[PDB]
Design a protein around this ligand. Structure first.
Ligand SMILES: [Mg+2]
Ligand SMILES: [Mg+2]
Lengths: 277, 251, 50, 50, 1341
DNA sequence: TCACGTATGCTATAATGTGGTCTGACGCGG
DNA sequence: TCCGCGTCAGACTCGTAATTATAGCATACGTGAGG
RNA sequence: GAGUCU
């Protein structure tokens, strides 16, 4: 017995009929015409090719059994669109699909934030340029050495190189054996702490009382414009919908409410004190 | 979430969920394709492997490693053992209104007392100062009170002095082997940056002054002020609970 | 150890007497680092039951 | 013994907090056990009054 | 006798053991190991040379094309160390290697001469090691620690009673290669031999033998002896070797030609054995019943039929003996297998062995290591050959083969990396010898089995993995590639080799931050041996046997030097005279004893070699180049000490100091300190922050100067001569003609490294310690480092200490210091601090650095300039902005209340928010420097432009001075050559010098000198320009930064923290303590003379601690100051040069029989008064480690300063004025300010940031975090009963999100109310358990 | 109905079973 | 008797941020603006 | 990963 997933699938595909020249054409003749038996025993037989192609395409993004799975999917489209009428062989044609289906599916899954086809192939242009620049500039190539080789924007070379930077995980320890990781340092800035929470309770409870303080028509017009007491933040012209119905008298009364309130902050002890804030 | 620089970071669960969803969606596609069973079986083995890795990584087979060579932390791992939620974030906690420093003698102090630095006690008792500053009518709002304390105005030291009288503080040393590892004292504001400890309670803490550090905790609530003074005060805790003999003994 | 140190710290230990002393020095400091945790694990077992 | 008497307690939250977290949770899950929060550990966990 | 820098201040040495071997360079191992890795070795492969020869030449799978290594070269570094430390880049060199693509013809057999292509390819930049043994990685000095691992070879071991219940000691063997699979042989309870590869499953030991083509018959005829059984007529007979019936009972009546020797049931003693052997007894008649049980050795087939009568290895019986006699066999071979001596192991193993022949064994071996896979004759044979028997997958290395052969008692020392058939069998043989009785197991902790593996070897290892990563891509692209088009560089990748070496000089446990808060920490950290790391132990895997001290350590590793961490026996400092053996084992020097006379020839004995000889100890008195005076000498051999005769003495310890480390050598009177406290003292000596004023130690050992100089921090004279120019910044010395080279001017330049940052944010300054135009000898210290004084190591300060209690202010080693020490600012430390300001690129836009910042008072913008950078020299405190950074922000949703408040003042927030670099909270100092790194193409600040103007003009005056001093020094020689030939002194110096180089003489050897000086002048003239261009280019050049980063401004602050209560101080005998109070001078104790004490220590901190050295230090330190205060009085009185000569002379020759002998008749008048000037602070004294000063010598010295024998003085309380009841020990103890300073340690938090998932407070002052309330601390309030105190800390102080914000509001409203909830960490536990597929729900009331 | 980023598609020489660490201990089941 | 699994004290300070490799171009697929 | 108190 062997209870590992890999060496079991490998045992199965082993006892598989290795096809010859017009054996491929004989089955694929009835495969394109549509045959139950042909599709399977063509695909079943040619799994041995997929493994070898996937073996070289490893240690790059997925493990191994992952490349075989997406490799087997390329072998199936090789069988659907093979032409036995053409004198050329299947192992030639299918090698194009299995190298292709693995290459193109790796680009998507290998990256945690999904990186698209254009930006990845953009990037590979810059990467292979870098290796040739590097042999003759000893030190790694700069983003301007790469941009100036292709005569393309430094922003565009920096943009794509910036997307290559890999993602560190939160459960990675800085300590070693078992000290602390990155969650143990990183703050939740979205939830504000008691000091910050109570400050807007105190700022806005201070203001609920400063509303009752100013004149009845001045705290009506000023509050409902900014959307403090009303439902919607309106403008000088839009306060006319309510009862104001004025453009000059609304603007005089808005600023009249703020001027009496500016001297309420000069006397209570803020004004220039709370100007820095 | 984003690291300050452009780099991002993610949990190891996102990496295990992705393996599971990829293999599940591909399985659906290979069932759609009515592929031979040999292909379908490989995919069902890989689905079992990814689910088993998600739930408990290192249990069924060799755990799936990520980029670092270490294995991806599974769900089970955030539950189980020492660094699990239980032992680290639930039967024990990080605490507000706390600090520490290097301790030093206070042989002048009385047995119910301990030297608490100015600037430590100022940061410790911030909410009570903002509360006194509004009562005496010195600050209009909390933002105003915050700046008065940040400037360390002369008025603020006098109010800090007022809050702390008859308001006890808890002092703790590692290791906390027995209950006397924490004792309550009346704080005495001092000039330097170092905690002054009463010599007679030194036996309970096993604290020598060759560079020990001690944790400070504020009992905020009135219940906690009374619990500190009635149970955990240094003067109430003289005999050892292990043996009916005094731990508070001159050396 | 079958050979004990005849000397004292006022008189001073010689090269070998020190070397012999270090066997015991390290083993003591070793228990301060390691064996403390077998002992502290007893504290923990005891607390969880009572 | 200590280690067994601690795990024999009907509070599974006391047991999963001591040791053997993986085993405790599964045996409690299959029996459909209900912990009524008796002891100190349990209320320390939920953040209640002892 | 003594040099000029020694003449300034001589240490009175109390030594008595003349040092035959002087202290070697203490940083030898770092430099010599890495030097092997880089030096291109021609043949004897080492480092990079070995790497290429090993992996190359790499050939294709078609076998048509291959790459071949020629030669490699190292390019000069892009930035030197100076500029690497600044920019933040690795100090590394271009690796340029010549590689050649040789292609064979596939038609011709090997058509070798087809394409011989060639190019010199870039693969990676290897980090270079500094002069001091450091690597500068990303602008940090880092050290790679030497590893101590189990040596390769064979090692025999045994589980005693760990294996099994009976307690059968199962003996085992392990063949450990440098690369390749392990080979284990081991017994079982039932004494069957077994083999396991890579500690896989158990396979019968005879299976590897069948795989090496050994037939059943050959296997028995390796291990067992033969007994020939002759059948004559009827009576059965047996061939006797009398020695074999040894300690055995005679089973039958042993009778020979005509004599009964032993009766049935009788023990055959040594006498029965010599009776048969003297009578020369060869055949004996025996019963037929005796073979019943014997094992037949070979196959015996019937001559008549031709079939097996009995197979090899099968137990005979009477019916088998009948079939053999009648068949036609009357001479049977049989296995000789004693129950206690020659054991039948292989015999019983063969019956357990399921395999039959060679091919059956190879299958079974294949089936173990590759299980499930169907075997083939190709796969089974190929695997087993690639395990131990391939040049590729296996290598013992030279050390492995050498230790392997020396274990198996071989003649041959060097040999093959592959295991031979002989090797595997010889090992199985020795394993069985150990089980038998002769042979013992080797112990692992023996340093003869622990090999030292420094930087160079481990850098070579990683570089190989680099080449091996490339081997894949070479074999790949050789097959696919066109042969015609393909050059070698298209197949090579540089990134894997760069990456594998960068992984070592970066991620590795052994590459770490240099502990440089102290010269001693640098040099003892570089001398460090860790057995942790890859290829080594783990704390998980560390027992107590590895940790503890071993006999072998003696003289190799210091037993008094190791952390008191979890790493307590794992990490180890190297001893003083210790060295790495040629192979890698440790070795210690030893004076050979020939004819009983002690020869000054020294032999470095390896761990192995030491055990043979008897080594006398250093305590033994020689007759001064006669021999041992005492008839009996205390010596040590075979890991033990005993007394011996004098002709039996073979060797002797070279120095008194050799068992100890560098750290421990600096502890005075270490001989009187307990090992336990001595350990901490040497560990804390390393933590000692260097002070503002480097103060020498009055009570030294003498090693101070070896440490300070070898540490690299002191600028030393490369060549002696007169100092032409002295200055705070640099020293220029003109060299003496005899050492000066004839080509150049011969003027050395030392630009001294000035107030600069350390890794611990402490200070580094080099001050010139020789005066303007002073005569200097080669190898003298021209400039002092941070913790060094006239060449000697100065870690801290010595001061007047009184041992007496004081109102419990020295309670538990709490320390009472005078205001006068704080007033003198002598324990005040400098802390240079590095804070960076980074303009990055967010989604919303690039960040600006301008003084134009939204929401800012004029107090912040006052110290900034137009560009938004603080002025150099401006004092700053927490809150103050150092660099004005502003960041883009989306037009964020203003809350209506905010919109009102912004409309009230008018100042509405702009699109660009704010992220300015401002002084850390509470810290504060003076800005000493600002450095600006702008990317190539981003808009520069005008400040950056000022800095480029400053750097350029400075560079121009710097290289002007280079050419100017060098030209003046060069023509100074030409002028002297021109006089030797055509003397026209006064008249030639009148008109311009510019036309001096045309002038020659008649053609002599001196004319040839004029030519070199004139050609070299133009060489420097043309070099001056290409040098100026290099500086000017590097200054104009944009610095290439991380992605998203536009520019960085690095601001340097200088904090000057003085001592205060909480600061940790200590002596050097492990005597810790914390300042508790700074007592005013008026209050301190004072002696009859009136002089106030500096520090008052607790006497009760001594008897417990058993560190008496601190008291001997105090008494002697007092005596030393007593001499200083007498010389100070005589210099103030101004008595006479002849008088100072007498008193100092009597002092230096005071000891009973001192080693050093200073005659003052040699000193001139000017030399004596420079010396007295330095001795008046106190005569520095040296107490070697074990060769120290005795009580009598110290008391004798006390009488020279007119001080009491007792070293106790009558002190008087400063407060009261009355006397203390008894005399109190007072004197001078050299104390040390540890880095544990209270300004850093003190931390406090009310409310702060919260974690992302747990929603609990952060951790550490680094993050401004709350304190950990662990389950230990939970049990304390549980136990009291205080459940409210606990609930507070479990909810509203921790997770409870409603609780924490609500409670903060209750407390500002005054109301101290508990309004709790449920921790978010429990809410997390619920979802984490539910995501496991477990229903956890809250069944309510 | 283009513009733009994103995705799907197909390439016929033959090519057809994979390839990091090597050491803990003391207890307690199945 | 042998293999597998489970435990293995308590807080603190510092410190840094790594690597690789995926061809090239043509029609299809979705949303958003302008005639 | 290098430390500090036990
Ligand atoms: Mg103590
Ligand atoms: Mg202590």
């Amino acid at each position: 017995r062997v209870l590992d997933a890999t060496q079991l699938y490998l045992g199965e595909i082993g006892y598989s009929p290795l096809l010859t020249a017009e054996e491929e054409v004989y089955f694929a003749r009835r495969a394109l015409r549509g045959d139950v038996a042909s599709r399977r025993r063509m695909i079943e037989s040619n799994l041995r090719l997929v493994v070898k192609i996937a073996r070289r395409y490893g240690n790059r993004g997925l493990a191994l059994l992952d490349l075989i799975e997406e490799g087997n999917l390329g072998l199936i489209r090789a069988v659907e669109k093979f032409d036995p009428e053409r004198g050329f062989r299947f192992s030639t044609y299918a090698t194009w699909w299995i190298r292709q289906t693995i290459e193109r599916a790796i680009m998507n899954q290998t990256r945690t934030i999904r990186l698209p086809i254009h930006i990845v192939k953009e990037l590979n242009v810059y990467l292979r340029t870098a290796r040739e620049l590097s042999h003759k500039l000893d030190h790694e190539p700069s983003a301007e050495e790469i941009a100036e080789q292709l005569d393309k924007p430094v922003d565009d070379v920096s943009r794509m190189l910036r997307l290559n930077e890999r993602i560190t995980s939160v459960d990675t320890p800085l300590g070693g054996d078992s000290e602390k990781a990155l969650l143990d340092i990183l703050a939740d800035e979205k939830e504000n702490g008691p000091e910050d929470t109570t400050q807007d309770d105190d700022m806005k409870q201070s203001i609920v009382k400063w509303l009752f303080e100013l004149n009845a028509k001045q705290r009506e017009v000023l509050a409902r414009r900014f959307g403090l007491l009303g439902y919607e933040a309106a403008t000088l012209e839009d306060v006319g919908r309510e009862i104001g119905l004025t453009r000059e008298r609304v603007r005089q009364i808005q600023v009249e409410g703020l001027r009496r309130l500016r001297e309420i902050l000069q006397t209570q002890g803020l004004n220039i004190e709370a100007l820095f804030l | 979430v984003p690291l300050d620089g452009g780099r991002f970071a993610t949990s190891d669960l996102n990496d295990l969920y992705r393996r599971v969803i990829n293999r599940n969606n591909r399985l659906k596609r290979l069932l759609d394709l009515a592929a031979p069973d040999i292909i379908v079986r490989n995919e069902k083995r890989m689905l079992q492997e990814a689910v088993d890795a998600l739930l408990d990584n290192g249990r069924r087979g060799r755990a799936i490693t990520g980029s670092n060579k270490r294995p991806l932390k599974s769900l089970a791992d955030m539950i189980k053992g020492k660094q699990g939620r239980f032992r680290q974030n639930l039967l024990g906690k990080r605490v507000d209104y706390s600090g520490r420093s290097v301790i030093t003698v206070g042989p002048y102090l009385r047995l119910h007392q301990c030297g608490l630095p100015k600037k430590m006690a100022l940061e410790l008792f911030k909410p009570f100062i903002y509360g006194k500053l509004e009562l005496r009518g010195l600050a209009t709002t909390i933002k105003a009170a915050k700046k008065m304390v940040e400037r360390e105005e002369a008025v603020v030291w006098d109010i800090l002095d007022e809050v702390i009288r008859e308001h006890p503080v808890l002092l703790n040393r590692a290791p906390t082997l027995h209950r006397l590892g924490i004792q309550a004292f009346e704080p005495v504001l001092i000039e330097g940056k170092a905690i002054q400890l009463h010599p007679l309670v030194c036996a309970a803490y096993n604290a020598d002054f060759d560079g020990d550090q001690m944790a400070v905790h504020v009992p905020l609530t009135l219940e906690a002020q009374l619990e500190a003074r009635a149970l955990m005060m240094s003067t109430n805790n003289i005999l050892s609970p292990a043996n009916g003999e005094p731990i508070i003994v001159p050396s | 150890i079958e050979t004990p140190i005849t000397a004292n710290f006022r008189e001073g230990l010689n090269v070998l007497q020190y070397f012999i002393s270090t066997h015991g020095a390290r083993k003591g400091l070793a228990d301060t680092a390691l064996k403390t945790a077998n002992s502290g694990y007893l504290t923990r077992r005891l607390v969880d039951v009572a | 013994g200590i280690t067994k008497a601690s795990l024999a307690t009907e509070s599974f939250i006391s047991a999963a907090s001591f040791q053997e977290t993986t085993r405790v949770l599964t045996e409690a899950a299959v029996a459909g056990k209900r912990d009524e929060l008796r002891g100190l550990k349990e209320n320390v966990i939920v953040g209640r009054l002892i | 006798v003594y040099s000029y820098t020694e003449k300034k201040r001589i240490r009175k040495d109390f030594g008595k053991r003349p040092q035959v071997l002087d202290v070697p360079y203490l940083l030898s191992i770092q430099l010599d190991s890495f030097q092997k890795f880089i030096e291109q070795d021609p043949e004897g492969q080492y480092g990079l040379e070995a790497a290429f020869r090993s992996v190359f030449p790499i050939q294709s799978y078609s076998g048509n094309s291959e790459l071949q290594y020629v030669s490699y070269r190292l390019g000069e570094p892009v930035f030197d160390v100076q500029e690497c430390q600044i920019r933040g880049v690795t100090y590394s060199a271009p690796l340029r290697v010549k590689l050649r693509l040789v292609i064979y013809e596939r038609e011709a057999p090997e058509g070798t001469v087809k394409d011989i292509k060639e190019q010199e390819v870039y693969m990676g930049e290897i980090p270079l090691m500094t002069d001091n043994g450091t690597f500068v990685i990303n602008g940090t000095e880092r050290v790679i620690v030497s590893q101590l691992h189990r040596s390769p070879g064979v090692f025999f071991d045994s589980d005693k009673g760990k294996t099994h219940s009976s307690g059968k000691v199962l003996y085992n063997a392990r063949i450990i290669p440098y690369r390749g699979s392990w080979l284990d042989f081991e017994f079982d309870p039932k004494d069957n031999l077994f083999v396991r590869i890579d500690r896989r499953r158990k396979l019968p030991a005879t299976i590897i033998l069948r795989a090496l083509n050994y037939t059943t018959e050959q296997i028995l005829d390796l291990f067992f002896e033969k007994v020939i059984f002759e059948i004559r007529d009827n009576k059965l007979q047996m061939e006797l070797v009398p020695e074999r019936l040894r300690g055995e009972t005679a089973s039958f009546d042993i009778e020979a030609n005509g004599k009964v020797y032993v009766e049935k049931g009788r023990r055959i003693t040594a006498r029965h054995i010599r009776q048969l052997e003297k009578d020369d007894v060869k055949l004996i008649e025996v019963p037929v019943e005796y073979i019943a049980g014997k094992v037949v050795a070979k196959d015996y087939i019937d001559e008549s039929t031709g079939e097996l009568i009995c197979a090899a290895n099968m137990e005979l019986s009477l019916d088998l003996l009948a079939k053999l006699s009648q068949s036609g066999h009357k001479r049977i071979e049989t296995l000789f297998t004693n129950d206690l001596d020659h054991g039948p192991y292989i015999s019983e193993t063969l019956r357990v062995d399921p395999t039959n022949d060679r091919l059956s064994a190879l299958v079974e071996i294949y089936r173990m290591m590759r299980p499930g896979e169907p075997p083939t004759r190709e796969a089974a044979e190929s695997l087993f050959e690639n395990l131990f028997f391939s040049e590729d997958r296996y290598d013992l290395s030279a050390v492995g083969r050498m230790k392997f052969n020396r274990s198996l008692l071989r003649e041959e020392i060097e040999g093959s990396g592959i295991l031979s058939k002989d090797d595997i069998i010889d090992v199985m043989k020795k394993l069985i010898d150990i089980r038998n009785g002769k042979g013992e197991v080797d112990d692992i902790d023996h340093l003869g089995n622990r090999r030292i593996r420094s930087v160079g070897e481990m850098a070579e290892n990683q570089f190989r993995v680099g080449l091996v990563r490339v081997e894949r891509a070479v074999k790949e692209r050789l097959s696919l590639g066109d042969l015609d088009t393909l050059m070698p560089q298209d197949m090579i990748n540089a990134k894997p080799i760069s990456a594998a070496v960068k992984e070592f000089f970066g991620s590795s446990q052994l590459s770490q931050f240099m502990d440089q808060n102290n010269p001693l920490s640098e040099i003892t950290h570089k001398r460090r041996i860790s057995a942790l790391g890859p290829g080594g132990l783990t704390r998980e895997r560390a027992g107590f046997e590895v940790r503890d001290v071993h006999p072998t350590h003696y003289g190799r590793v210091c037993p008094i030097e190791t952390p008191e961490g979890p790493n307590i026996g794992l990490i180890n400092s190297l001893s003083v005279y210790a060295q790495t053996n040629e192979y890698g084992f440790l070795e210690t020097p030893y004076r050979k004893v020939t004819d009983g006379v002690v020869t000054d020839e020294i032999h470095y004995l390896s761990a192995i070699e030491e055990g043979n000889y008897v080594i006398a100890q250093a305590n033994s008195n020689l007759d001064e180049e006669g021999h041992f005076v005492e008839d009996l000498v205390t010596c040590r051999s075979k890991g033990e000490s005993s007394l011996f005769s004098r002709d039996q003495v073979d060797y002797m310890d070279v120095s008194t100091q050799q068992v100890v480390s560098v750290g421990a050598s600096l502890i005075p009177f270490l001989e009187h300190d307990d090992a336990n406290r001595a350990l901490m003292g040497a560990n804390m000596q390393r933590q000692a922050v260097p002070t503002l004023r480097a103060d020498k130690p009055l009570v030294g050992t003498g090693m101070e100067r070896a440490v300070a100089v070898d540490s690299g921090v002191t600028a030393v004279a490369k060549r002696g001569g007169v100092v032409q120019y002295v200055d705070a910044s640099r020293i220029v010395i003109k060299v003496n003609e005899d050492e000066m080279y004839p080509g150049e001017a011969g003027i050395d330049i030392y630009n001294l490294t000035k107030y600069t940052r350390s890794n611990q944010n402490t200070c580094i300054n080099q001050m010139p310690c020789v005066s303007l135009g002073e005569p200097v000898e080669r190898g003298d210290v021209l400039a002092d480092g941070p913790s060094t004084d006239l060449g000697e190591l100065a870690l801290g300060q010595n001061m007047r200490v009184a041992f007496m209690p004081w109102n419990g202010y020295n309670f538990e080693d709490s320390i009472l210091v005078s205001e006068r020490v704080v007033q003198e600012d002598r324990f005040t430390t400098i802390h240079i601090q590095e804070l960076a300001c980074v303009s990055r690129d967010t989604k919303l836009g690039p960040e600006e650095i301008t003084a134009d910042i939204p929401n800012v008072g004029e107090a912040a913008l006052s110290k900034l300039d137009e560009s938004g950078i603080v002025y150099i020299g401006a004092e700053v405190t927490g809150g103050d902005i150092l660099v004005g950074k502003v960041t883009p922000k989306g037009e964020t949703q203003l809350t209506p209340e905010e919109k009102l408040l912004r409309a009230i003042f008018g100042e509405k927030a702009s699109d660009v928010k704010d992220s300015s670099l401002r002084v850390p909270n509470g810290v504060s100092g003076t800005v000493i420097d600002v450095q600006v790194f702008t990317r190539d193409g981003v808009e520069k600040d005008k400040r950056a432009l000022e800095i480029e103007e400053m750097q350029l003009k400075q560079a121009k005056k710097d290289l002007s001075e280079e050419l100017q001093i060098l030209e003046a020094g060069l023509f100074s020689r030409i002028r002297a050559v021109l006089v030797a030939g055509g003397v026209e002194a006064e008249k030639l110096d009148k008109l311009p010098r510019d036309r001096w180089l045309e002038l020659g003489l008649t053609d002599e050897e001196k004319q040839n000198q004029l030519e070199q000086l004139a050609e070299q002048y133009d060489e420097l003239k043309h070099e001056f320009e290409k040098k100026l261009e290099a500086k000017r280019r590097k200054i104009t050049q944009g610095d290439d930064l991380a992605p998203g980063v536009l520019k960085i401004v690095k601001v340097y602050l200088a904090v000057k923290r003085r001592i205060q209560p909480g600061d940790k101080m200590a002596g050097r005998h492990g005597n810790k303590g914390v300042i508790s109070k700074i007592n005013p001078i008026e209050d301190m104790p004072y002696d009859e003379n009136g002089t106030p004490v500096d520090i008052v220590l607790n006497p009760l901190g001594v008897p417990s601690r058993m560190n008496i050295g601190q008291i001997l230090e105090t008494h002697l330190g007092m005596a030393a100051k007593g001499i200083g205060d007498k010389i100070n009085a005589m210099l103030k009185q101004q008595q006479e040069v002849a008088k100072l000569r007498e008193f100092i002379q009597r002092a230096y020759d005071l000891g009973a029989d001192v080693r050093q002998k200073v005659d003052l008749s040699t000193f001139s008048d000017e030399e004596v008064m420079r010396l007295a000037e330095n001795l008046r602070k106190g005569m520095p004294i040296a107490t070697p480690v074990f060769d120290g000063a005795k009580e009598a010598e110290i008391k004798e010295l006390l009488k020279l300063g007119d001080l009491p024998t007792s070293g106790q003085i009558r002190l008087y309380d400063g407060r009261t004025g009355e006397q203390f009841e008894r005399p109190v020990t007072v004197g001078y103890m050299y104390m040390l300010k540890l880095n544990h300073l209270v300004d850093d340690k003190m931390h406090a938090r009310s409310t702060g940031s919260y974690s992302l998932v747990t929603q609990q407070p952060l951790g550490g002052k680094a993050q401004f975090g709350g304190q950990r309330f662990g389950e230990m601390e939970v049990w304390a309030l549980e136990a009291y009963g205080a459940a409210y105190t606990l609930q507070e800390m479990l909810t509203v102080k921790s997770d409870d999100v409603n609780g924490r914000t609500k409670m903060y509001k209750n407390i500002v409203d005054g109301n101290h109310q508990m309004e709790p909830g449920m921790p978010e960490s429990f809410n997390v536990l619920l979802k984490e358990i539910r995501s496991l597929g477990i229903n956890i729900e809250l069944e309510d009331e």
